[PDB]
Design a protein around this nucleic acid. Structure first.
Length: 132
RNA sequence: AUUAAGACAUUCGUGAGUGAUUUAUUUCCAUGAAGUGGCGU
């Protein structure tokens, strides 16, 4: 009976529980302009041997792509009635590392080798998962 | 039935070993067992 499942969504539920904000990962090109100048014979990238035009990139605010300041991969985004709201992944997900062992019950087992660390994630109080 | 299920950060472990409340310090300084005779003219 299952026919169609939507991609899992990150939904924010506010105190005024009448509207929900859907959060998406920030596009990797956000805040930057990519042109691909086509004057030809200028410069061609070879991605593992395939022809491709050169990706001229500028911030949408010139200078070039400074990968020392590139941080779009750390941000999640949602629609606002203005610009795009950027939320850090830190502010959404809380992470803790848990140490675990199996208590050595003697008269048996070669299991001193039971020793591990696990990562557990907690969602912020206003954030839930959803899909259709 | 879903990179899933099971799993104590637990076992052993003396805040203990050595250590003088001891060293230095005069119950001492000053000081008269002294003073006076009386009456019988």
């Amino acid at each position: 009976v299952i026919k169609q499942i939507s991609p899992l969504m990150l939904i924010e539920c506010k105190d005024d529980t009448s509207s929900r904000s859907i959060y998406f990962p920030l596009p990797l090109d956000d805040g930057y302009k990519v042109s691909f100048n086509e004057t030809s014979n200028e410069d061609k990238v070879f991605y593992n041997g395939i022809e491709c035009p050169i990706p001229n990139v500028y911030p949408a605010s010139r200078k070039f792509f400074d990968h020392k300041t590139y941080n779009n991969y750390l941000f999640w985004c949602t629609q606002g009635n203005n610009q795009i709201k950027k939320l850090l992944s830190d502010e959404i997900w809380i992470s803790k590392m848990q140490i675990g062992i199996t208590k050595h019950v003697e008269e048996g087992e070669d299991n001193d080798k039971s020793f591990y660390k696990q990562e557990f994630l907690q969602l912020k109080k206003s954030f839930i998962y959803a899909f259709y």
